C-alpha cells in the first residue's frame, strides 16, 4: 500500500524596518522628506528643524552625518515602489527615535549583545562602517529569503 | 457704497515653562521648595533627598551646581507674583526630569538642532553660559511678546 | 478606677527587591536562569542572547562582568527557599532594566544622591565595590529588621 505523509513549515521572524518588541518606544511624526526616497529599514538624517512651524526636514543618510532615527513599516503612509515599500518626496515619515527595530544589514557575521552599532554611507548596518552611532545591538540576527536583517536598540539623541 | 473688510491674526506658539509635545515625559512630584522662590521656566537643584520620608528638597540653581529638572506650568499649584507664575516656599512643586519643555533664555541667536544646553547661574538658557548640562536642543525658537523662549530636550539624571 | 491607654506602631517602608515608585520603568520577561539560583534583590548578567528564539540567558554577577538588571519581587513566579523568596534554575525571571528598585546593600554608611553605584562580586550594593555601573543612587536608605536596603535608579544598557 502507501504510507501517509505530513509536512510542516515555519513562518519567518521579521521583515525589514518593523518594530521588534512592545518595549518603551517613541515614534515621531511631523517629519517631511526634503529630497529623494527613504527605504523602510534605513537610517535618517535631519537637514533642518523649523523654528516656528515645527516640522523637521529629514533625508537619507550620507557621508559625514549623524544618524537620527530609523523609518518603520506601515501599510498606509508608505508608497509601493521598487518592488518594496518606500517613502516618497514631500510626504510624512514615521521615524523611530527610541525602541527596538529590525534594520537592514550588509554584514555577514553575527554580532555581540551590548556593542555599539556602526553604519555605512547609505544608512545600513555594517560590521566596519565608517559612521559611528550611540545605539547598541539587541541580539536578533536572522534573514528573510535573500535579505539579511538585524535587531538594534535605539536611544534618543 | 462701502467695501467690507476682513482681518486675520495668529496665536502665539507657547508660554514659558510649558510642555512642548506629548512624547515620553516624566514629571516628578513629592518635592518641596526648601527656600526662596522658583520661576516656572527655570532649572532647579536638589539640596538633599530624605532617606525615610522621600521628599526631595529643591532650590533655585546657583553657581557650580548640577541642574536636575525644569519646573512646569500649572494653574492650581502655582502662586502669582511679579505679574508671573512662581512656586512659593514650602508646598509641592512639579519638576520635569524628562521630555520636551519651553525654557526662558537670554540668548539672542537661534541654536543648532543637536548641541549641549548651557545655562547661566540662575537657571536660564544662555549661549555662552557657564553651567554645562547633558540636555540637548530640540529646534523650537520663538518669542512671546517681549519674552524669549527656547525648546530643549531633557534626560533623566 | 483606671486610666485608659492607647498605643501606636508604624510599618516598614519597603522589602528587598520590590519596585519603589511608579516612574518610567521597563520590566523585561523572556529570560531564563542558565545556571544556579538568583536572589530577588541582586543584579544579573547576560550570558548569551539567542539570535532566533529571542530568549536571554541570565546568571548571577561574577568577577569582571557588567550588570544588566535587578530581579523583581512577585508572588507567583518565585519559590520560597532559605526562608526567603528566590528564583530557581530553569525558570522565567522578571528582570528590571530601567526604573527605581530596592536593592540589597552591604555598606554601612548613607550614600549621596547623584553618585554612581558600585557593586561587589556577588551582585549586592557595596560602598567600595570593584564592579562599576552606569546606574545612580536615588536617596532611599532604610533597614528591614536585620536587612539593609538601598534605592537605586537604573538605565537601559
CSV table of C-alpha atoms in Angstrom, one decimal:
chain,number,residue,atom,x,y,z
A,1,UNK,CA,0.0,0.0,0.0
A,2,UNK,CA,1.1,3.6,0.8
A,3,UNK,CA,2.3,5.4,3.9
A,4,UNK,CA,0.6,8.7,4.6
A,5,UNK,CA,2.8,11.8,4.9
A,6,UNK,CA,2.5,15.1,6.7
A,7,UNK,CA,4.6,18.3,6.3
A,8,UNK,CA,5.4,21.3,8.4
A,9,UNK,CA,6.6,24.8,7.6
A,10,UNK,CA,7.6,27.6,10.0
A,11,UNK,CA,7.0,31.3,9.2
A,12,UNK,CA,9.7,33.9,9.1
A,13,UNK,CA,10.6,36.0,12.2
A,14,UNK,CA,10.6,39.6,10.9
A,15,UNK,CA,10.6,41.9,7.8
A,16,UNK,CA,12.9,44.9,7.3
A,17,UNK,CA,12.1,48.0,9.1
A,18,UNK,CA,9.5,46.8,11.6
A,19,UNK,CA,9.4,47.0,15.4
A,20,UNK,CA,10.6,44.0,17.4
A,21,UNK,CA,9.0,44.1,20.9
A,22,UNK,CA,6.5,46.2,22.8
A,23,UNK,CA,9.1,47.9,25.0
A,24,UNK,CA,9.2,51.7,25.5
A,25,UNK,CA,9.4,53.4,22.2
A,26,UNK,CA,9.0,56.9,20.8
A,27,UNK,CA,8.0,57.3,17.1
A,28,UNK,CA,8.0,60.8,15.6
A,29,UNK,CA,5.5,62.3,13.1
A,30,UNK,CA,5.7,65.8,11.7
A,31,UNK,CA,8.7,64.8,9.5
A,32,UNK,CA,9.0,65.7,5.8
A,33,UNK,CA,11.1,64.1,3.1
A,34,UNK,CA,13.1,67.0,1.9
A,35,UNK,CA,14.6,65.2,-1.1
A,36,UNK,CA,14.9,61.7,-2.5
A,37,UNK,CA,13.5,58.4,-1.3
A,38,UNK,CA,13.9,56.8,2.1
A,39,UNK,CA,13.9,53.0,2.4
A,40,UNK,CA,11.9,51.5,5.3
A,41,UNK,CA,14.9,49.9,7.1
A,42,UNK,CA,17.4,52.7,6.8
A,43,UNK,CA,18.8,55.5,8.9
A,44,UNK,CA,17.6,59.1,8.6
A,45,UNK,CA,19.5,62.4,9.0
A,46,UNK,CA,17.9,65.7,9.9
A,47,UNK,CA,18.7,68.5,7.4
A,48,UNK,CA,16.9,71.3,9.3
A,49,UNK,CA,14.4,71.7,12.1
A,50,UNK,CA,11.9,74.6,11.6
A,51,UNK,CA,11.5,77.1,14.5
A,52,UNK,CA,8.0,78.5,14.0
A,53,UNK,CA,6.2,75.7,12.2
A,54,UNK,CA,7.9,72.8,14.0
A,55,UNK,CA,8.3,70.3,11.1
A,56,UNK,CA,11.7,68.5,10.8
A,57,UNK,CA,13.1,68.1,7.3
A,58,UNK,CA,14.7,64.7,7.0
A,59,UNK,CA,16.8,63.0,4.3
A,60,UNK,CA,18.7,59.7,3.7
A,61,UNK,CA,22.0,59.3,5.5
A,62,UNK,CA,25.1,60.4,3.7
A,63,UNK,CA,28.9,60.6,4.4
A,64,UNK,CA,29.9,62.5,7.5
A,65,UNK,CA,26.5,62.9,9.1
A,66,UNK,CA,24.9,61.9,12.4
A,67,UNK,CA,22.0,59.5,12.2
A,68,UNK,CA,18.8,60.5,14.0
A,69,UNK,CA,16.2,57.7,13.6
A,70,UNK,CA,15.0,54.7,11.6
A,71,UNK,CA,11.9,54.6,9.5
A,72,UNK,CA,9.3,51.9,10.3
A,73,UNK,CA,6.7,49.8,8.4
A,74,UNK,CA,3.1,51.0,7.7
A,75,UNK,CA,0.6,49.9,5.2
A,76,UNK,CA,-1.0,53.3,4.7
A,77,UNK,CA,1.7,56.0,4.6
A,78,UNK,CA,4.3,54.1,2.6
A,79,UNK,CA,4.3,54.2,-1.2
A,80,UNK,CA,4.7,50.9,-3.2
A,81,UNK,CA,7.8,51.2,-5.4
A,82,UNK,CA,10.9,49.4,-6.5
A,83,UNK,CA,9.3,46.1,-5.5
A,84,UNK,CA,9.2,47.2,-1.9
A,85,UNK,CA,7.9,49.9,0.5
A,86,UNK,CA,9.4,53.4,0.4
A,87,UNK,CA,8.7,56.9,1.5
A,88,UNK,CA,8.4,59.5,-1.3
A,89,UNK,CA,9.4,63.1,-1.5
A,90,UNK,CA,7.0,65.6,0.0
A,91,UNK,CA,5.4,63.1,2.4
A,92,UNK,CA,5.3,62.4,6.1
A,93,UNK,CA,7.6,59.8,7.7
A,94,UNK,CA,7.3,57.6,10.8
A,95,UNK,CA,10.8,57.8,12.3
A,96,UNK,CA,11.6,55.8,15.4
A,97,UNK,CA,13.8,57.7,17.9
A,98,UNK,CA,13.8,55.0,20.6
A,99,UNK,CA,13.0,51.3,20.9
A,100,UNK,CA,13.9,48.2,19.1
A,101,UNK,CA,13.6,47.8,15.3
A,102,UNK,CA,14.7,45.3,12.6
A,103,UNK,CA,17.2,47.0,10.3
A,104,UNK,CA,18.9,46.1,7.1
A,105,UNK,CA,22.4,44.7,7.3
A,106,UNK,CA,25.3,44.4,4.9
A,107,UNK,CA,27.2,42.3,7.4
A,108,UNK,CA,28.0,38.6,7.2
A,109,UNK,CA,28.8,37.7,10.8
A,110,UNK,CA,26.6,37.5,13.9
A,111,UNK,CA,27.2,40.5,16.3
A,112,UNK,CA,27.6,40.6,20.1
A,113,UNK,CA,25.0,41.7,22.6
A,114,UNK,CA,26.0,45.1,24.0
A,115,UNK,CA,28.3,46.6,21.4
A,116,UNK,CA,27.9,49.8,19.6
A,117,UNK,CA,26.4,49.9,16.1
A,118,UNK,CA,28.3,51.2,13.0
A,119,UNK,CA,26.5,52.3,9.9
A,120,UNK,CA,27.8,52.9,6.3
A,121,UNK,CA,27.3,55.8,3.9
A,122,UNK,CA,23.7,54.8,2.9
A,123,UNK,CA,22.4,54.1,6.3
A,124,UNK,CA,22.5,50.3,6.5
A,125,UNK,CA,24.2,48.4,9.3
A,126,UNK,CA,27.8,47.2,8.6
A,127,UNK,CA,30.4,45.5,10.8
A,128,UNK,CA,33.1,48.0,9.9
A,129,UNK,CA,31.1,51.1,8.9
A,130,UNK,CA,32.7,54.5,9.0
A,131,UNK,CA,29.7,56.2,10.7
A,132,UNK,CA,29.6,55.7,14.5
A,133,UNK,CA,26.3,55.7,16.5
A,134,UNK,CA,25.3,55.6,20.1
A,135,UNK,CA,22.9,52.7,19.6
A,136,UNK,CA,23.6,49.2,20.7
A,137,UNK,CA,22.7,45.7,19.4
A,138,UNK,CA,19.8,43.7,20.8
A,139,UNK,CA,20.6,40.1,19.8
A,140,UNK,CA,18.3,39.5,16.9
A,141,UNK,CA,20.1,38.1,13.9
A,142,UNK,CA,18.0,36.4,11.1
A,143,UNK,CA,17.3,36.8,7.4
A,144,UNK,CA,14.2,36.9,5.1
A,145,UNK,CA,14.6,34.8,1.9
A,146,UNK,CA,17.6,36.7,0.4
A,147,UNK,CA,17.5,39.8,2.7
A,148,UNK,CA,19.6,40.0,5.9
A,149,UNK,CA,18.1,41.7,8.9
A,150,UNK,CA,19.5,42.7,12.3
A,151,UNK,CA,17.9,44.0,15.5
A,152,UNK,CA,19.1,47.2,17.1
A,153,UNK,CA,18.3,49.2,20.2
A,154,UNK,CA,18.0,52.9,19.6
A,155,UNK,CA,18.3,55.8,22.1
A,156,UNK,CA,17.1,59.4,22.0
A,157,UNK,CA,19.5,61.9,20.6
B,1,UNK,CA,-21.5,102.4,-1.0
B,2,UNK,CA,-18.7,100.8,1.0
B,3,UNK,CA,-16.2,98.0,0.8
B,4,UNK,CA,-16.3,95.5,3.6
B,5,UNK,CA,-13.1,94.3,5.2
B,6,UNK,CA,-11.9,91.1,6.9
B,7,UNK,CA,-8.8,90.7,9.1
B,8,UNK,CA,-6.6,87.9,10.4
B,9,UNK,CA,-4.5,87.3,13.5
B,10,UNK,CA,-2.5,84.3,14.7
B,11,UNK,CA,-2.0,83.0,18.2
B,12,UNK,CA,1.4,82.5,19.8
B,13,UNK,CA,3.1,79.1,19.9
B,14,UNK,CA,4.0,78.6,23.6
B,15,UNK,CA,4.5,80.1,27.0
B,16,UNK,CA,7.4,79.8,29.4
B,17,UNK,CA,7.7,76.5,31.2
B,18,UNK,CA,5.1,74.7,29.1
B,19,UNK,CA,5.2,71.1,27.9
B,20,UNK,CA,6.0,71.1,24.2
B,21,UNK,CA,4.9,67.7,22.8
B,22,UNK,CA,3.3,64.5,24.0
B,23,UNK,CA,6.5,62.4,23.8
B,24,UNK,CA,7.8,60.3,26.6
B,25,UNK,CA,7.9,62.6,29.6
B,26,UNK,CA,8.4,62.1,33.4
B,27,UNK,CA,7.1,64.6,35.9
B,28,UNK,CA,8.4,64.1,39.5
B,29,UNK,CA,6.1,65.2,42.3
B,30,UNK,CA,6.8,64.8,46.0
B,31,UNK,CA,9.3,67.7,46.0
B,32,UNK,CA,9.4,70.7,48.4
B,33,UNK,CA,10.9,74.1,47.7
B,34,UNK,CA,13.4,74.4,50.6
B,35,UNK,CA,13.9,78.2,50.4
B,36,UNK,CA,13.4,81.1,48.1
B,37,UNK,CA,11.1,81.3,45.1
B,38,UNK,CA,11.3,79.4,41.8
B,39,UNK,CA,10.2,80.7,38.5
B,40,UNK,CA,8.2,78.4,36.2
B,41,UNK,CA,10.6,78.4,33.3
B,42,UNK,CA,13.9,77.8,35.2
B,43,UNK,CA,16.1,74.9,36.3
B,44,UNK,CA,16.3,73.6,39.9
B,45,UNK,CA,18.8,71.8,42.1
B,46,UNK,CA,18.4,69.0,44.6
B,47,UNK,CA,19.8,70.2,48.0
B,48,UNK,CA,19.0,66.9,49.9
B,49,UNK,CA,16.9,63.8,49.5
B,50,UNK,CA,15.3,62.4,52.7
B,51,UNK,CA,16.2,58.8,53.5
B,52,UNK,CA,13.0,57.8,55.1
B,53,UNK,CA,10.2,60.2,54.1
B,54,UNK,CA,11.5,60.5,50.5
B,55,UNK,CA,10.7,64.2,49.7
B,56,UNK,CA,13.4,65.8,47.6
B,57,UNK,CA,14.3,69.4,48.7
B,58,UNK,CA,14.7,71.5,45.6
B,59,UNK,CA,16.1,75.1,45.3
B,60,UNK,CA,16.8,77.6,42.6
B,61,UNK,CA,20.0,77.0,40.7
B,62,UNK,CA,23.2,78.7,41.9
B,63,UNK,CA,26.8,78.8,40.7
B,64,UNK,CA,28.6,75.5,40.3
B,65,UNK,CA,25.7,73.1,40.9
B,66,UNK,CA,24.3,70.3,38.7
B,67,UNK,CA,20.8,71.0,37.4
B,68,UNK,CA,18.1,68.4,37.9
B,69,UNK,CA,15.0,69.4,36.0
B,70,UNK,CA,12.7,72.2,34.9
B,71,UNK,CA,9.6,73.4,36.7
B,72,UNK,CA,6.3,73.1,34.7
B,73,UNK,CA,3.2,75.2,34.3
B,74,UNK,CA,0.0,74.5,36.3
B,75,UNK,CA,-3.0,76.7,37.1
B,76,UNK,CA,-3.6,75.1,40.5
B,77,UNK,CA,-0.2,74.6,42.2
B,78,UNK,CA,1.3,77.9,41.3
B,79,UNK,CA,1.0,81.3,43.0
B,80,UNK,CA,1.0,84.6,41.1
B,81,UNK,CA,3.7,87.2,41.9
B,82,UNK,CA,5.6,89.8,40.0
B,83,UNK,CA,2.9,89.5,37.3
B,84,UNK,CA,4.3,86.0,36.7
B,85,UNK,CA,3.8,82.5,38.0
B,86,UNK,CA,6.1,81.2,40.7
B,87,UNK,CA,6.4,78.4,43.3
B,88,UNK,CA,6.5,79.7,46.8
B,89,UNK,CA,8.5,78.5,49.8
B,90,UNK,CA,7.0,75.2,51.0
B,91,UNK,CA,4.3,73.2,49.2
B,92,UNK,CA,4.7,70.7,46.5
B,93,UNK,CA,6.4,71.5,43.2
B,94,UNK,CA,6.2,69.8,39.7
B,95,UNK,CA,9.7,69.3,38.2
B,96,UNK,CA,10.1,67.7,34.8
B,97,UNK,CA,13.0,65.2,34.6
B,98,UNK,CA,12.5,64.0,31.0
B,99,UNK,CA,10.7,65.3,27.9
B,100,UNK,CA,10.4,68.5,25.9
B,101,UNK,CA,9.7,71.8,27.5
B,102,UNK,CA,10.0,75.5,26.8
B,103,UNK,CA,12.6,77.4,28.8
B,104,UNK,CA,13.4,81.0,29.5
B,105,UNK,CA,16.6,82.3,27.8
B,106,UNK,CA,18.7,85.4,27.5
B,107,UNK,CA,20.4,84.4,24.2
B,108,UNK,CA,19.8,86.4,21.0
B,109,UNK,CA,20.6,83.9,18.2
B,110,UNK,CA,19.0,80.7,17.0
B,111,UNK,CA,20.6,77.5,18.3
B,112,UNK,CA,21.6,74.4,16.4
B,113,UNK,CA,19.5,71.3,16.4
B,114,UNK,CA,21.8,68.9,18.2
B,115,UNK,CA,24.0,70.6,20.8
B,116,UNK,CA,24.5,70.6,24.6
B,117,UNK,CA,22.4,73.1,26.5
B,118,UNK,CA,24.4,75.6,28.7
B,119,UNK,CA,22.7,77.6,31.5
B,120,UNK,CA,23.7,80.6,33.5
B,121,UNK,CA,24.0,81.0,37.2
B,122,UNK,CA,20.2,81.4,37.7
B,123,UNK,CA,18.8,78.6,35.5
B,124,UNK,CA,18.0,80.4,32.3
B,125,UNK,CA,19.5,79.2,29.0
B,126,UNK,CA,22.4,81.2,27.6
B,127,UNK,CA,24.6,80.5,24.6
B,128,UNK,CA,27.8,81.4,26.5
B,129,UNK,CA,26.7,80.1,29.9
B,130,UNK,CA,29.0,78.6,32.4
B,131,UNK,CA,27.0,75.6,33.8
B,132,UNK,CA,27.0,72.7,31.4
B,133,UNK,CA,24.2,70.2,31.2
B,134,UNK,CA,23.6,66.9,29.4
B,135,UNK,CA,20.4,68.2,27.7
B,136,UNK,CA,20.2,69.0,24.0
B,137,UNK,CA,18.2,71.5,22.0
B,138,UNK,CA,15.1,70.5,20.1
B,139,UNK,CA,14.6,73.2,17.5
B,140,UNK,CA,11.9,75.5,18.8
B,141,UNK,CA,12.9,79.1,18.9
B,142,UNK,CA,10.2,81.8,19.3
B,143,UNK,CA,9.3,84.8,21.5
B,144,UNK,CA,6.1,85.7,23.4
B,145,UNK,CA,5.6,89.5,23.4
B,146,UNK,CA,8.9,90.6,24.9
B,147,UNK,CA,9.9,87.2,26.4
B,148,UNK,CA,12.4,85.0,24.6
B,149,UNK,CA,11.8,81.2,24.7
B,150,UNK,CA,13.6,78.1,23.5
B,151,UNK,CA,12.8,74.4,23.4
B,152,UNK,CA,15.1,71.8,25.0
B,153,UNK,CA,15.1,68.0,25.4
B,154,UNK,CA,15.7,66.7,28.9
B,155,UNK,CA,17.2,63.4,30.1
B,156,UNK,CA,17.0,61.6,33.4
B,157,UNK,CA,19.9,62.2,35.7
C,1,UNK,CA,-10.7,53.0,88.8
C,2,UNK,CA,-8.2,53.1,86.0
C,3,UNK,CA,-6.8,55.4,83.2
C,4,UNK,CA,-7.3,54.0,79.7
C,5,UNK,CA,-4.4,54.0,77.3
C,6,UNK,CA,-3.9,53.8,73.5
C,7,UNK,CA,-0.8,52.6,71.6
C,8,UNK,CA,0.6,53.2,68.1
C,9,UNK,CA,3.1,51.5,65.8
C,10,UNK,CA,4.4,52.0,62.3
C,11,UNK,CA,5.0,49.7,59.3
C,12,UNK,CA,8.2,49.2,57.3
C,13,UNK,CA,8.8,51.2,54.2
C,14,UNK,CA,10.0,48.5,51.8
C,15,UNK,CA,11.0,44.9,51.4
C,16,UNK,CA,14.1,43.8,49.3
C,17,UNK,CA,13.7,43.6,45.6
C,18,UNK,CA,10.4,45.5,45.2
C,19,UNK,CA,9.6,48.5,43.0
C,20,UNK,CA,9.9,51.8,44.7
C,21,UNK,CA,8.0,54.4,42.6
C,22,UNK,CA,5.6,54.3,39.6
C,23,UNK,CA,8.1,56.2,37.4
C,24,UNK,CA,9.0,55.2,33.8
C,25,UNK,CA,10.1,51.5,34.2
C,26,UNK,CA,10.7,48.7,31.8
C,27,UNK,CA,10.5,45.1,33.1
C,28,UNK,CA,11.8,42.5,30.5
C,29,UNK,CA,10.5,39.0,30.6
C,30,UNK,CA,11.6,36.2,28.2
C,31,UNK,CA,14.6,35.4,30.4
C,32,UNK,CA,15.7,32.0,31.8
C,33,UNK,CA,18.2,31.1,34.5
C,34,UNK,CA,21.1,29.5,32.7
C,35,UNK,CA,22.7,28.1,35.9
C,36,UNK,CA,22.3,28.5,39.6
C,37,UNK,CA,19.8,30.5,41.7
C,38,UNK,CA,19.2,34.2,41.6
C,39,UNK,CA,18.2,36.3,44.7
C,40,UNK,CA,15.3,38.8,44.4
C,41,UNK,CA,17.4,41.8,45.3
C,42,UNK,CA,20.5,41.0,43.3
C,43,UNK,CA,21.9,42.0,39.9
C,44,UNK,CA,22.2,39.7,36.9
C,45,UNK,CA,24.4,39.2,33.9
C,46,UNK,CA,23.6,38.3,30.3
C,47,UNK,CA,25.5,35.1,29.4
C,48,UNK,CA,24.0,34.8,25.8
C,49,UNK,CA,21.2,36.2,23.8
C,50,UNK,CA,19.6,33.8,21.4
C,51,UNK,CA,19.6,35.0,17.8
C,52,UNK,CA,16.4,33.2,16.6
C,53,UNK,CA,14.4,32.2,19.7
C,54,UNK,CA,15.0,35.5,21.4
C,55,UNK,CA,15.3,34.4,25.0
C,56,UNK,CA,18.1,35.9,27.0
C,57,UNK,CA,20.2,33.6,29.3
C,58,UNK,CA,20.8,35.3,32.7
C,59,UNK,CA,23.0,34.4,35.6
C,60,UNK,CA,24.5,35.9,38.8
C,61,UNK,CA,27.2,38.5,38.8
C,62,UNK,CA,30.8,37.4,39.0
C,63,UNK,CA,34.3,39.0,38.7
C,64,UNK,CA,34.8,41.2,35.7
C,65,UNK,CA,31.2,41.1,34.4
C,66,UNK,CA,28.9,44.1,33.7
C,67,UNK,CA,25.5,44.1,35.3
C,68,UNK,CA,22.3,44.2,33.3
C,69,UNK,CA,19.3,44.4,35.6
C,70,UNK,CA,17.8,43.6,39.0
C,71,UNK,CA,15.3,40.8,39.8
C,72,UNK,CA,11.8,41.9,40.7
C,73,UNK,CA,9.6,40.6,43.5
C,74,UNK,CA,6.5,38.6,42.6
C,75,UNK,CA,4.2,36.2,44.5
C,76,UNK,CA,3.7,33.7,41.6
C,77,UNK,CA,6.9,33.3,39.7
C,78,UNK,CA,9.2,33.0,42.8
C,79,UNK,CA,9.7,30.0,45.1
C,80,UNK,CA,10.5,30.2,48.8
C,81,UNK,CA,13.9,28.8,49.9
C,82,UNK,CA,16.2,29.5,52.8
C,83,UNK,CA,13.2,31.2,54.5
C,84,UNK,CA,13.4,33.7,51.6
C,85,UNK,CA,12.0,34.4,48.2
C,86,UNK,CA,14.2,33.4,45.3
C,87,UNK,CA,14.3,32.4,41.6
C,88,UNK,CA,15.4,28.9,40.7
C,89,UNK,CA,17.3,27.4,37.8
C,90,UNK,CA,15.4,26.9,34.6
C,91,UNK,CA,12.7,29.4,35.2
C,92,UNK,CA,11.4,32.8,33.9
C,93,UNK,CA,12.8,35.9,35.6
C,94,UNK,CA,11.3,39.4,35.8
C,95,UNK,CA,14.5,41.5,35.3
C,96,UNK,CA,14.1,45.3,35.6
C,97,UNK,CA,16.1,47.2,33.0
C,98,UNK,CA,15.1,50.7,33.9
C,99,UNK,CA,13.4,52.3,36.9
C,100,UNK,CA,13.7,52.5,40.7
C,101,UNK,CA,14.1,49.4,42.9
C,102,UNK,CA,15.1,48.5,46.5
C,103,UNK,CA,18.4,46.5,46.3
C,104,UNK,CA,20.5,44.7,48.9
C,105,UNK,CA,23.4,46.6,50.3
C,106,UNK,CA,26.4,45.5,52.4
C,107,UNK,CA,27.5,49.1,53.1
C,108,UNK,CA,27.2,50.8,56.5
C,109,UNK,CA,27.1,54.5,55.5
C,110,UNK,CA,24.4,56.6,53.9
C,111,UNK,CA,25.1,57.3,50.3
C,112,UNK,CA,24.8,60.6,48.4
C,113,UNK,CA,22.1,61.5,45.8
C,114,UNK,CA,23.7,61.6,42.3
C,115,UNK,CA,26.8,59.5,42.7
C,116,UNK,CA,27.4,56.3,40.7
C,117,UNK,CA,26.7,52.8,42.1
C,118,UNK,CA,29.4,50.3,42.7
C,119,UNK,CA,28.6,46.5,43.0
C,120,UNK,CA,30.6,43.7,44.5
C,121,UNK,CA,31.4,40.2,43.2
C,122,UNK,CA,28.1,38.6,44.4
C,123,UNK,CA,25.9,41.4,42.9
C,124,UNK,CA,24.9,43.3,46.0
C,125,UNK,CA,25.5,47.0,46.5
C,126,UNK,CA,28.7,47.9,48.3
C,127,UNK,CA,30.2,51.3,49.1
C,128,UNK,CA,33.6,50.4,47.7
C,129,UNK,CA,32.7,47.6,45.3
C,130,UNK,CA,35.0,46.8,42.4
C,131,UNK,CA,32.4,46.5,39.7
C,132,UNK,CA,31.4,49.9,38.2
C,133,UNK,CA,27.9,50.5,36.9
C,134,UNK,CA,26.2,53.3,35.0
C,135,UNK,CA,23.3,53.5,37.5
C,136,UNK,CA,22.9,56.2,40.1
C,137,UNK,CA,21.6,56.5,43.6
C,138,UNK,CA,18.1,57.8,44.4
C,139,UNK,CA,18.1,58.6,48.1
C,140,UNK,CA,16.2,55.8,49.9
C,141,UNK,CA,18.2,54.3,52.8
C,142,UNK,CA,16.3,52.1,55.2
C,143,UNK,CA,16.6,48.8,57.1
C,144,UNK,CA,14.1,46.0,57.3
C,145,UNK,CA,14.7,44.1,60.6
C,146,UNK,CA,18.3,42.9,60.1
C,147,UNK,CA,18.5,43.5,56.3
C,148,UNK,CA,19.8,46.8,54.9
C,149,UNK,CA,18.2,48.2,51.8
C,150,UNK,CA,19.1,51.0,49.3
C,151,UNK,CA,17.2,52.6,46.5
C,152,UNK,CA,18.8,52.9,43.0
C,153,UNK,CA,17.9,54.4,39.6
C,154,UNK,CA,18.5,52.2,36.6
C,155,UNK,CA,19.1,53.0,33.0
C,156,UNK,CA,18.8,50.9,29.8
C,157,UNK,CA,22.0,49.3,28.5
